[PDB]
Design a protein around this ligand. Structure first.
Ligand code: E8V
Ligand code: CL
Ligand code: CL
Length: 322
């Protein structure tokens, strides 16, 4: 069922007018089309926006839209960038949304920034490795993103390379996308209790998800940092220890628990003997110390990663080296 007539003009709830172009990408993030401001011109291949469209009863797009409306208003992000002295913040900007009826069905749409490639494609093209420099630079910016969304009451729960997109015009700026299964862990400053949430079905992506998620409890801040930990190892080494048994969640959980209890054994497993990046172990030890409701010391985690850059003779110059 086609959701749009190509070239049609759609008007959002703020009465801003947009024009719809052709589909973009290999289907990973649902029904998405290139989009631009309304004009006499057709929407081109270099369009600065995309429009996401789903049935109005689609739960994930409603969840995602609420996240973007609450936490990703352009001015709200810019104010944080200024006050925290960032070069940029990799939370996509929300440009508008509305309702669209076609063929007796109701759809919701949302206009967002258009991005370039996802990191998973680039990773695979680099024979499933990123350099230590790249991993550290990615992770510093992901820590900025996680701090910002956690301070706005949300956790992501599904950090991974396929959910990391580059700025279309700047390949040193990485953005975290896909908030359809994001979780509001602290609505109005009240932290969710250590417990399953019946409203949440999602467990994350099995190879990267947190021990909390494996235990059936709602995701919290420590879980997001743990996920990033597993991503860093995957990116550095091409592997995780539990990757041959991902059809058995009990196995995956058991391995993660054992490797949290003995982080030195994780470093021995994942890295060549005596050749483990010390910042990765220190990062994991720091995350291990977090309680379920505890606010992370994000600057301490970034300082740990910055020691890694110093150790390889570099600095945080914002260069992803992709
Ligand atoms: N804004 C975007 N721009 C380009 C792509 C894209 C995807 C591909 F899979 C691909 O191959 C490609 F070239 C481009 C995806 C998004 C996008 C961003 C989000 F934040 C989402 O939540 C989302 F669903 C989609
Ligand atoms: Cl705010
Ligand atoms: Cl390999």
């Amino acid at each position: 069922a086609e959701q749009f007539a190509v070239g049609e003009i759609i008007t959002d709830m703020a009465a801003a007018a947009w024009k719809v172009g052709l589909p973009i990408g290999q289907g990973g993030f649902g029904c998405i089309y290139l989009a631009d401001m309304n004009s006499s011109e057709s929407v081109g291949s270099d369009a600065p926006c995309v429009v996401k469209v789903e049935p109005s009863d689609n739960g994930p797009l409603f969840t995602e839209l609420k996240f973007y409306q609450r936490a990703a208003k352009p001015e709200q992000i810019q104010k944080w960038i200024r006050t925290r002295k960032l070069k940029y913040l990799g939370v996509p900007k929300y440009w508008g949304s509305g309702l669209h009826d076609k063929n007796g069905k109701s759809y919701r749409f949302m206009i967002m920034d258009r991005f370039g490639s996802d990191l998973q494609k680039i990773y695979e093209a680099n024979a499933k490795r990123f350099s230590r420099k790249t991993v550290l630079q990615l992770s510093l910016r992901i820590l900025d993103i996680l701090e910002y969304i956690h301070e706005h009451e949300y956790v992501h729960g599904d950090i991974k390379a396929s959910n990391l997109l580059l700025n279309y015009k700047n390949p040193d700026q990485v953005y975290l996308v896909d908030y359809g299964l994001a979780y509001r862990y602290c609505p109005e400053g009240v932290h969710k209790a250590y417990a399953a949430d019946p409203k949440r079905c999602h467990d994350g992506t099995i190879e990267f998800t947190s021990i909390d998620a494996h235990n059936g409890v709602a995701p919290s801040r420590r879980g997001d940092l743990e996920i990033l930990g597993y991503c860093m190892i995957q990116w550095l080494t091409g592997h995780l220890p539990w990757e041959d048994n991902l059809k058995d969640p009990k196995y995956v959980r058991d391995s993660k628990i054992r490797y949290r209890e003995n982080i030195a054994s994780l470093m021995d497993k994942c890295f060549p003997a005596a050749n483990a990046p010390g910042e990765i172990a220190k990062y994991m030890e720091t995350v291990k110390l977090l309680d379920y409701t505890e606010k992370p010391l994000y600057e301490n985690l970034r300082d740990i990663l910055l020691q890694g850059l110093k150790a390889i003779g570099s600095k945080d110059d914002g260069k992803l080296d992709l």
